[PDB]
């Protein structure tokens, strides 16, 4: 034919045609695209001449599938020769959106091959139009736990069926190169060895803080490159913006003759919120407009109010809505805001509170339309046009940057990802932006460089080939120059440069540093950079090249102290010439003294800076052919040791500074707990004098207190300092303190320790958090990404490693951690901390009867916290009672507080009491310390009845209004009883208040469920009332410890047979960790009056699993619904001991109710019970106001675990239907568990079941007809847990077994870090390994940034550092370590010679 022309907007730039014209189009290669969707009907989806393809027919395929075990997924046509949906286990591979399919677009880019024209009039091709496509539909739901296993099957399938390259969009911000998820890394190594190029988008988060503000110059570790592409084997791809852009434009023909404005044709950007221009003004219809100066009202009133689309420049003060709305007010019809900054890329507003005028941003100050001076006409194109782009040849804003988390240079290379036009569904095309557009450009190009290498170097093995495909692509790339600043683009942003395909299949040169890689990561840099660059020549003629090295660093806006993410050029240090043998290599030695720049740069980057850049090679004769180059980066400083956390908001405020994400709005020194800072947090709860407080107040920043307005304020003591103090007394007011961090770098090994503050060197921990934590920097790339993280696992509560109470005193609470670089130093951060459990001093005061002046003694605390506030209040009666009860009808919540009203405090320290407003003696005086201890005297308590007189001295004592609740006792012990006691409470069903609990005897069913639900949470011992129990100890022993010799929890000193709490075991170790389900020996020992030793032994069982309610039966009897639950079994620890049917009656409009008992207020569900009939049915009756979803069935096991279901939910099961439920069986507490996993159920022929119905609102419980089935575990968090039982389980539903329980038994995974640190660098030829318990070797390799150190992350276990060592050498030091979970273990080892 005479075919439409090809769009070379991208090919001209990346120089594709230099490869096409040498016969490299992808013919007989295959790209495996792992991604979201694909339409293989698309006209683009085409091969020319199947005869030359890798796979020549639908049968060549079924011949490849069975060949390697793939029993699933079809061949579709000559182009898309394999496709399987790995999420469903489906062959539904096409997405259904607005034709907008991501994976469609990606495939268009790598291998589109259309003959037809898109809407421009051109036809579009990929980099490899003649390559074949296998598509793996693979994508992630949170609901899975980990989609990784799916990606690995797609990778392994792709390899097996014979791909040449794989294209992944997959990414996890702040990847490491050496420690990504190992199952996925190894899958990738496996493709490399099969000669597969693994090409991965680098991510779209850009850099730390990117949704907030540019990064502080004290924080150079701002990189965020993706978790798989950051690995050494993949090719990791950054994105540049296309120079040409295909969009609907706007045209004023009255500006046709301005050729620098694309002939009167503008790029307009409406806000992502609204986008109302097409639907409100309509394409292809012409409208008036009128320049408005000044978006006030003045500006010629409203000339642009008749029909004119209003045209206004941006007022950087007035907001986008103060503008659109003010225009719509004057009659707008729709407004254009044209940019105030000249030459700038159309700011993105979003901004849509009060739009409704149909608005857009017109390109720049440029495109100020001033024809006939304000008046003009304009229309909106309905078809897309080619336009110069307002941001072409710029790095795309969001391409990931920086180094990998562990210090390596990535990404590797750049390609066009901004505004790329490619294929959508249903013969549509569209344009779309991101680093995963750039990635298929490079996937395509490595198709072609592979074709080449295969023709031109046929003696290259599978294993070596993908690594050379990469090294050519990089080394031949065009080093990009930032156009706004005229400086080389950072290699941390652009990699080895912009893609140059021709260069790569033409020059036959590539470059390599010492590490045999197309880029160079030097580690730390010290006043002298020396390194070895190596050029390689695949030609059999030869090349002579002249070279020179440009050295860069990061520019810093000195007004702001923030990186600008642009590079400044230091010095193009000069090189030389060298000649590169045919089929050989030559090595040159670059050397630069940078001593010169240290002072100027250390001044603006006090924690160090990057020294990076390129080494350029040109042909010595003609400097435009044989252009190749290598990137490098080092760190002037100690990259491994950069601060991991931002400094504490305390220290920063104290030195006039602020947090990177800290919102300083509000009253001076407000630290509301929802802001973002490093700090400590604690729980508060109010003190009430007229009723028992029934709920706490939530977390607040420790050291802050509500001021009059209820904002929480960092108060200072007399010396002008905040006070970090907790009062671990049981009252839930500041009883604990926990670390909250704003993390700057990825952290690992994080724990909390408490030392006595006179233990200055932190050598004797008194308490350590039971676990250790690890996590990500708070990079905040958009709203979904936390600006701070709270680690409640670091809660300290004044108990020690033993559970003993640590005395009131002055301690250091030390949070320690490590960055993710081997060899780094442990970073501590210290909080001075008071343990004070003592209320302030209530002495006496001077009341004078006619000045009405109450003045108390000056304020004195007991303990170190210090008095913080002085108060007087009375209880204003209201609805006749001194407190108000408040029922949050929507959250089903009740709260109660005093009607406290406060008397102002005159500056001299006293109070003028309003006795018009209540009696003296109904006023309370209150003194609070900084730890939360609260003293309150009711001053009437010590009033003389001689009221009116002359000034009297009044005695004040505390009323113990702030105390810890205590549990209702009521119990009388006979000698019959065991001695054991536990607690009893019902489970709320509607209200979310804490149900009333009270003590109960325990003379059977020795089983507890430590879940803090009120019911059987502990085992305490209570003695006969007149018996004596001297020296009373409880110890708990594991079942292994049959000699009862090493306790795992013991009563603290001073426990007594009648203080129950002192004796209560809550299934917890001495450290306060929940014990595992199992049996334990609870041993009570005491001496009586006579000194005879007594011991009472009991076997307690711990188990907190909720019971599983099965669907029962329903029958109609005398016209009334009858419910018959299935027979519960009673076989111990889980057997049912309580069975209820009830319903909730509405009263006062709701289903719960408040009752004002003698102590205080209590909340209950309006429960009404249904007698069990003698046939085991319950009669579910008529009852005005009550529907079947108001009737419940409830069960309790011997442990006190409770479950319930509405009868509506149980009745949704047909009478012929059965129910199967799937779950995981982990040997840990319910709060320590995965719940996330997906599964496939197949019917008796192997067909996936369709049209799912769920049982009792659980997506792990299905309603199915009777039959044979199988279930297969699809996904689960494989970093957290290992499957142990069968992955496929067969089961049969039937009217007898109409409820099946299928569980996948699992074990749980725990890692540790090990670092071996040496004295002096080890001699050449030494090898370091970890030797495992079974005798195997785990090789370690030198740390880049810390070369005396070798480390790895391992499975929790016992290891020994073995070292191989030549000549006469020896290692001394402890080489053995028993790792702990999430811990970091350092072995300092010593190298010795003679
Ligand atoms: Ca196409
Ligand atoms: Ca408080
Ligand atoms: Ca307290
Ligand atoms: Ca070390
Ligand atoms: Ca105190
Ligand atoms: Ca107060
Ligand atoms: Ca319980
Ligand atoms: Ca289906
Ligand atoms: Ca160092
Ligand atoms: Ca463990
Ligand atoms: Cl922004
Ligand atoms: Mg912005």
Distance CA 859, CA 870 (A): 8
Contacts of 52 (CB under 8 A, 6+ apart): 27, 28, 130
Distance 1251 CA to ligand 8 centre (A): 9
Distance CA 78, CA 58 (A): 8
Crossing angle, helix 462-475 and helix 435-456, to 10 degrees? 120
Crossing angle, helix 182-193 and helix 462-475, to 10 degrees? 100
Distance 607 CA to ligand 3 centre (A): 41
3-class DSSP assignment, residue 1177: coil
Pairing between strand 844-848 and 853-856? antiparallel
Distance CA 820, CA 406 (A): 6
CA atoms lying within 13 Å on the CB side of residue 841: 13
Determine if residue 638 is labeled as part of a ligand binding site: yes
Determine if residue 1015 is labeled as part of a ligand binding site: yes
Ion ligand 1: residues, CB within 5 A, are 44, 108, 112, 114, 124, 423
Catalytic-role residue among 102, 105, 536, 700: 102
CB 1220 within 8 A of CB 1264: yes
H helix or E strand, kind and range, residue 1066: none
- Backbone dihedral angles phi then psi of residue 142, each to the nearest 5 degrees: -60, -30
Strand partners, 645: 743
1233-1260: burial string, b at 16+ Cβ within 10 Å, e else? bbebbbbebbeeeeeeeeeeeebbeeeb
Distance CA 795, CA 791 (A): 8
Determine if residue 828 is labeled as part of a ligand binding site: no
Crossing angle, helix 182-193 and helix 148-160, to 10 degrees? 10
CA atoms lying within 13 Å on the CB side of residue 509: 28
Crossing angle, helix 102-111 and helix 435-456, to 10 degrees? 30
Determine if residue 223 is labeled as part of a ligand binding site: yes
What is each CA distance from 1132 to 328, 1097, 1101, 1343, 1390, in whole angstroms? 73, 20, 10, 55, 57
Query: From the CB of residue 560, how many other CB atoms can be counted at a distance below 10 Å?
Result: 12
Query: From the CB of residue 1151, how many other CB atoms can be counted at a distance below 10 Å?
Result: 17
Determine if residue 1115 is labeled as part of a ligand binding site: no
Distance 1347 CA to ligand 9 centre (A): 8
Catalytic-role residue among 227, 436, 475, 769: 436
Distance CA 400, CA 410 (A): 9
Q: Which ligand is nearest to the CA of 1251?
A: 8
Determine if residue 132 is labeled as part of a ligand binding site: no
Pairing between strand 1311-1318 and 1328-1331? unpaired
Determine if residue 929 is labeled as part of a ligand binding site: yes
Distance CA 526, CA 598 (A): 10
CB 697 within 8 A of CB 703: no
Among candidates 253, 274, 273, 271, which has minimal Cα distance to 263? 253
CB 883 within 8 A of CB 1159: no
CB 781 within 8 A of CB 731: no
Contacts of 329 (CB under 8 A, 6+ apart): none
Distance CA 767, CA 734 (A): 18
| Residue pointed to by tokens 């491994």 | 640
Q: In the 3-class helix/strand/coil scheme, how is 703-756 assigned residue by residue?
A: CEEECCCCCEEECCCCCCCCCCEECCCCCCCCCCEEEEECECCCEEEEEEEEEE
Determine if residue 232 is labeled as part of a ligand binding site: no
Among candidates 873, 882, 837, 841, which has minimal Cα distance to 858? 841
What is each CA distance from 202 to 206, 714, 1151, in whole angstroms? 10, 42, 54
Distance 726 CA to ligand 2 centre (A): 10
Query: From the CB of residue 478, how many other CB atoms can be counted at a distance below 10 Å?
Result: 18
Q: This structure's resolution (angstroms)?
A: 2.9
3-class DSSP assignment, residue 660: coil
Distance CA 681, CA 1248 (A): 50
Query: From the CB of residue 634, how many other CB atoms can be counted at a distance below 10 Å?
Result: 23
| Residue pointed to by tokens 């960092």 | 714
1167-1193: burial string, b at 16+ Cβ within 10 Å, e else? beebeeeeeebbebeeeeebebebbbb
Contacts of 835 (CB under 8 A, 6+ apart): 725, 726, 727, 728, 798, 806, 807, 808, 809, 810, 811, 931
* 388, two tokens: 């110069």
| Residue pointed to by tokens 């980099």 | 127
Distance 871 CA to ligand 6 centre (A): 6
Experimental method, per PDB record: X-ray
CB 978 within 8 A of CB 1098: yes
Among this protein's residues, is 1041 annotated catalytic? no
CB 202 within 8 A of CB 196: no
- Backbone dihedral angles phi then psi of residue 702, each to the nearest 5 degrees: -70, 140
Among candidates 227, 647, 197, 186, which has minimal Cα distance to 406? 227
Among candidates 940, 929, 932, which has minimal Cα distance to 728? 932
Identify the sign of the CA torsion 303, 307, 312, 318.
Answer: positive
What is each CA distance from 429 to 12, 45, 111, 275, 811, in whole angstroms? 20, 13, 14, 20, 66
Q: Which ligand is nearest to the CA of 1243?
A: 8
3-class DSSP assignment, residue 971: coil
Distance CA 1064, CA 1019 (A): 5
Distance CA 594, CA 529 (A): 7
In this structure, what DSSP letter does residue 142 have?
Answer: G
Ion ligand 10: residues, CB within 5 A, are 1310, 1381
Determine if residue 1150 is labeled as part of a ligand binding site: no
Determine if residue 756 is labeled as part of a ligand binding site: yes
Ion ligand 7: residues, CB within 5 A, are 1009, 1011, 1013, 1015-1017, 1200
Distance CA 409, CA 236 (A): 10
Distance 1139 CA to ligand 4 centre (A): 61
Distance 758 CA to ligand 5 centre (A): 20
Distance 859 CA to ligand 5 centre (A): 11
Length of the chain: 1394
Distance CA 237, CA 533 (A): 23
Domains detected in the chain: 11-243+394-481 (3.40.50.200), 245-386 (3.50.30.30), 508-641 (2.60.40.1710), 649-835 (no CATH), 844-885+895-951 (2.60.40.10), 980-1102 (no CATH), 1113-1307 (2.60.40.10), 1311-1392 (2.60.40.1120)
Among candidates 234, 204, 209, 203, which has minimal Cα distance to 221? 209
Distance CA 1158, CA 1048 (A): 40
Q: Which ligand is nearest to the CA of 124?
A: 1
Distance CA 261, CA 252 (A): 10
Catalytic-role residue among 9, 11, 35, 1329: 35
| Residue pointed to by tokens 């404005």 | 261
In this structure, what DSSP letter does residue 1010 have?
Answer: -
Distance 745 CA to ligand 11 centre (A): 21
Q: Which ligand is nearest to the CA of 1230?
A: 7
CB 1044 within 8 A of CB 1035: yes
Euclidean distance between the first and final Cα of the chain, in Å?
A: 83
Determine if residue 733 is labeled as part of a ligand binding site: yes
Q: In the 3-class helix/strand/coil scheme, how is 89-125 assigned residue by residue?
A: CECCCCCCCCCCCHHHHHHHHHHCECCCCCCCCCECE
DSSP string, 263-289: TTEE-EE--SS---HHHHT-TT-EEEE
Among this protein's residues, is 146 annotated catalytic? no
- Backbone dihedral angles phi then psi of residue 640, each to the nearest 5 degrees: -60, -30
Strand partners, 1171: none
Query: From the CB of residue 867, how many other CB atoms can be counted at a distance below 10 Å?
Result: 20
Among candidates 733, 707, 704, which has minimal Cα distance to 716? 704
Distance CA 1102, CA 1107 (A): 15
Distance 556 CA to ligand 11 centre (A): 18
Contacts of 317 (CB under 8 A, 6+ apart): none
Distance CA 143, CA 857 (A): 62
Among candidates 1232, 1352, 1222, which has minimal Cα distance to 1281? 1232
Distance CA 135, CA 1111 (A): 43
Determine if residue 493 is labeled as part of a ligand binding site: no
Distance CA 487, CA 982 (A): 74
Instruction: Give residue numbers after which the chain breaks (C–N above 2.5 Å).
Output: 349
Identify the sign of the CA torsion 797, 801, 805, 811.
Answer: negative
Verify cis geometry, omega within 30 degrees of 0, for the bond prior to 411. Answer: yes
3-class DSSP assignment, residue 1190: helix
Among candidates 1268, 1265, 1273, 1200, which has minimal Cα distance to 1237? 1273
CB 6 within 8 A of CB 125: yes
Distance 209 CA to ligand 12 centre (A): 12
Distance CA 26, CA 452 (A): 10
Distance 929 CA to ligand 2 centre (A): 9
| Residue pointed to by tokens 């595992």 | 1076
Chain-centroid distance of CA 969 in Å reads 45
* 678, two tokens: 């490093």
Among this protein's residues, is 102 annotated catalytic? yes
Virtual CA dihedral for 1242, 1248, 1249, 1252, nearest 10 degrees? 120
Distance CA 799, CA 768 (A): 10
Determine if residue 731 is labeled as part of a ligand binding site: yes
CB 934 within 8 A of CB 728: no
Could you tell me what percentage of the chain is helix, strand and coil, using 3-state DSSP and rounding each to the nearest 5? 10, 35, 50
Distance 1316 CA to ligand 4 centre (A): 7
Distance CA 591, CA 615 (A): 11
CB 1148 within 8 A of CB 1161: no
């Amino acid at each position: 034919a005479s075919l439409p022309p090809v769009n070379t907007d991208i090919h001209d730039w990346v120089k594709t045609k230099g490869a096409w014209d040498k016969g490299y189009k992808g013919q007989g290669k295959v790209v495996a695209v792992i991604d979201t969707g694909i339409d293989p009907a698309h006209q683009s989806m085409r091969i020319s001449d199947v005869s030359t393809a890798k796979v020549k027919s639908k049968e060549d395929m079924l011949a490849r599938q069975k060949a390697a075990g793939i029993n699933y997924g079809s061949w579709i046509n000559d182009k898309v020769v394999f496709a399987h949906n790995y999420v469903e286990n489906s062959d539904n591979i096409k997405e259904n959106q607005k034709y907008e399919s991501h994976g469609m677009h990606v495939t268009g880019i790598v291998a589109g091959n259309s003959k037809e024209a898109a809407a421009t009039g051109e036809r579009f091709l990929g980099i490899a139009p003649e390559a074949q496509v296998m598509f793996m539909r693979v994508f992630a739901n949170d609901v899975m736990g980990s989609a990784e296993s799916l990606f690995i099957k797609a990778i392994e399938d792709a390899v097996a069926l014979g791909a040449d390259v794989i294209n992944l969009s997959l990414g996890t911000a702040n990847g490491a190169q050496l420690s990504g998820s190992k199952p996925l890394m190894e899958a990738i190594e496996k493709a490399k060895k099969a000669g597969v190029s693994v090409v991965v988008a680098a991510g779209n988060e850009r850099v730390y803080g990117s949704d907030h503000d540019d990064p502080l110059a004290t924080n150079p570790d701002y990189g965020l490159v993706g978790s798989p592409s950051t690995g050494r084997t993949p090719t990791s791809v950054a994105a540049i913006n296309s120079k040409w852009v295909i969009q609907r434009l706007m045209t004023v023909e009255e500006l046709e003759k301005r050729a620098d404005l694309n002939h009167g044709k503008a790029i307009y950007s409406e806000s992502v919120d609204f986008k109302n221009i097409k639907d409100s003004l309509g394409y292809d219809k012409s409208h008036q407009f009128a320049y408005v100066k000044e978006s006030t009202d003045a500006g010629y009133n409203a000339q642009d109010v008749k029909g004119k689309i209003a045209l206004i420049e941006r007022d950087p003060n007035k907001t986008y809505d103060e503008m659109i709305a003010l225009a719509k007010k004057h009659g707008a019809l729709g407004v254009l805001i044209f940019n105030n900054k000249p030459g700038q890329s159309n700011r993105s507003m979003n901004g849509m509170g009060i739009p409704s005028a149909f608005i857009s941003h017109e390109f720049g100050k440029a495109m100020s339309q001033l024809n006939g001076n304000g008046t003009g006409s304009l229309e909106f194109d309905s078809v897309v046009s080619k336009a110069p782009s307002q941001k072409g040849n710029e790095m795309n804003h969001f391409s990931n940057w920086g180094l990998t988390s562990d210090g390596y240079l990535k990404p590797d290379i750049t390609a066009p990802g901004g505004d790329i036009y490619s294929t959508y569904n249903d013969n549509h095309y569209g344009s779309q932006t991101g680093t995963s557009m750039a990635s298929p450009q490079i996937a395509g190009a490595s198709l072609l460089v592979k074709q080449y290498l295969e023709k031109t170097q046929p003696n290259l093995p599978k294993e070596k080939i993908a690594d050379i495909v990469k090294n050519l692509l990089m080394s031949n790339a065009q080093i990009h120059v930032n156009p706004e600043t005229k400086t080389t683009t950072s290699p941390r942003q652009q990699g080895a440069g912009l893609l140059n395909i021709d260069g790569a299949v033409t020059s036959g040169l590539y470059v390599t540093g010492k590490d045999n890689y197309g880029s160079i990561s030097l580690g730390n840099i010290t006043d002298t950079m020396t390194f070895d660059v190596t050029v390689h020549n695949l030609s059999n003629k030869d090349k002579t090249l002249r070279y020179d090295t440009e050295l860069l660093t990061d520019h810093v806006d000195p007004q702001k102290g923030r990186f600008t993410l642009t590079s400044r050029s230091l010095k193009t240090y000069q090189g030389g010439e060298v000649t590169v043998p045919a089929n050989g290599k030559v090595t040159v030695r670059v050397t630069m003294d940078v001593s010169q720049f240290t002072k100027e740069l250390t001044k603006q980057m006090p924690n160090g800076y990057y020294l990076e850049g390129f080494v350029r090679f040109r042909d010595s004769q003609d400097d435009q052919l044989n252009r190749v180059n290598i990137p490098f980066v080092g760190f002037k400083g100690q990259f491994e040791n950069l601060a991991v956390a931002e400094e504490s908001i305390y220290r920063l405020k104290s030195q006039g500074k602020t947090g990177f994400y800290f919102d300083e709005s509000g009253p001076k020194d407000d630290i509301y707990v929802g802001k973002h800072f490093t700090g400590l947090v604690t729980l508060g709860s109010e003190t009430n004098v007229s009723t028992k407080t029934i709920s706490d107040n939530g977390l607040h920043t420790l050291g802050t207190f509500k001021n009059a307005d209820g904002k929480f304020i960092l108060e200072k003591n007399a010396q002008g300092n905040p006070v970090l103090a907790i009062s671990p007394n049981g009252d839930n007011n500041q009883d604990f303190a926990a670390f909250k961090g704003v993390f700057l770098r990825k952290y690992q090994g994080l724990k909390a320790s408490v030392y006595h503050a006179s233990d200055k060197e932190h050598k004797n921990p008194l308490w350590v958090s039971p676990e250790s934590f690890k996590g990500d920097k708070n990079f905040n790339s958009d709203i979904r990404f936390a600006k701070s993280t709270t680690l409640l696992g670091t809660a300290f509560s004044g108990k020690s490693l033993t559970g003993a109470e640590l005395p009131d005193g002055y301690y250091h609470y030390v949070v320690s951690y490590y960055p993710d670089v081997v060899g780094a130093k442990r970073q501590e951060m210290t909080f001075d901390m008071i343990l004070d459990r003592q209320k302030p001093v209530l002495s006496q005061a001077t009341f004078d009867p006619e000045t009405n002046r109450f003045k108390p003694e000056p304020l004195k605390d007991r303990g170190l916290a210090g008095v913080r506030k002085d108060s007087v209040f009375y209880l204003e009666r209201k609805d006749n009672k001194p407190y108000t009860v408040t029922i949050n009808d929507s959250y089903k919540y009740v709260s109660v507080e005093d009607n406290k009203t406060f008397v102002e405090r005159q500056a001299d320290g006293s109070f003028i009491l309003p006795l018009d407003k209540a009696k003296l003696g109904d006023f309370y005086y209150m003194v609070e310390d900084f730890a939360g201890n609260v003293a309150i005297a009711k001053l009437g308590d010590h009033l003389p009845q001689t009221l009116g007189k002359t000034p009297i001295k009044l005695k004040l004592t505390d009323g113990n209004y702030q105390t810890k609740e205590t549990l209702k006792d009521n119990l009388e012990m006979t000698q019959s009883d065991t001695g054991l006691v536990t607690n009893q409470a019902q489970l709320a069903v509607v209200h979310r208040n804490q149900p009333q609990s009270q003590l109960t005897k325990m003379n059977q069913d020795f089983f507890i469920s430590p879940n803090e639900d009120g019911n059987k949470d502990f085992v305490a011992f209570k003695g006969l009332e007149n018996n004596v129990y001297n020296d009373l100890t409880v110890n708990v022993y594991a079942k292994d410890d049959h000699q009862k010799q090493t306790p795992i929890w013991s009563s603290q000193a001073g426990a007594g047979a009648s203080a129950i709490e002192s004796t209560a075991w809550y299934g917890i170790t001495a450290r306060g960790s929940k014990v595992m389900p199992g049996d334990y020996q609870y041993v009570v020992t005491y001496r009586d009056e006579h000194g005879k030793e007594h011991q009472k032994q009991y076997t307690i069982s711990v188990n907190d699993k909720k019971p599983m309610i099965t669907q029962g039966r329903f029958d109609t009897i005398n016209g009334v619904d009858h419910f018959t639950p299935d027979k519960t079994k009673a076989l111990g620890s889980s057997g049912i001991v309580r069975e209820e049917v009830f319903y909730l009656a509405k009263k006062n409009g709701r289903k719960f109710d408040v009752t004002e008992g003698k102590d205080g207020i209590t909340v209950s569900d309006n429960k009404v019970y249904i007698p069990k009939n003698p046939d085991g049915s319950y009669t579910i009756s008529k009852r005005d106001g009550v529907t079947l979803s108001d009737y419940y069935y409830l069960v309790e096991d011997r442990a006190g675990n409770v479950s319930f279901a509405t009868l509506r939910d149980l009745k949704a099961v047909g009478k012929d239907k059965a129910v199967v439920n799937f779950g995981l069986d982990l040997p840990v507490p319910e709060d320590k568990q995965i719940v996330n996993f997906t599964y496939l159920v197949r019917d008796a022929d192997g067909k996936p079941i369709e049209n799912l119905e769920y049982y009792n609102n659980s997506g792990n419980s299905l309603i199915l007809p009777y039959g044979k089935y199988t279930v297969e575990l699809l996904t689960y968090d494989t970093n957290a847990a290992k499957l142990e039982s069968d992955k496929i389980v067969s089961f049969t539903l039937s009217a007898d077994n109409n409820f099946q329980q299928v569980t996948f038994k699992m074990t749980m995974l725990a890692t540790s870090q090990i670092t071996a640190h040496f004295d002096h660098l080890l001699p050449e030829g030494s090898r370091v390994s970890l030797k495992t318990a079974q005798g195997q070797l785990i090789p370690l390799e030198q740390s880049l940034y810390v070369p005396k150190a070798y480390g790895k992350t391992v499975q929790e276990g016992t290891y020994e550092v073995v070292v191989s060592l030549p000549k006469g050498y020896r290692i001394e030091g402890n080489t053995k370590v028993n790792t702990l979970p999430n811990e970091v273990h350092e072995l300092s080892l010593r190298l010795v010679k003679v």
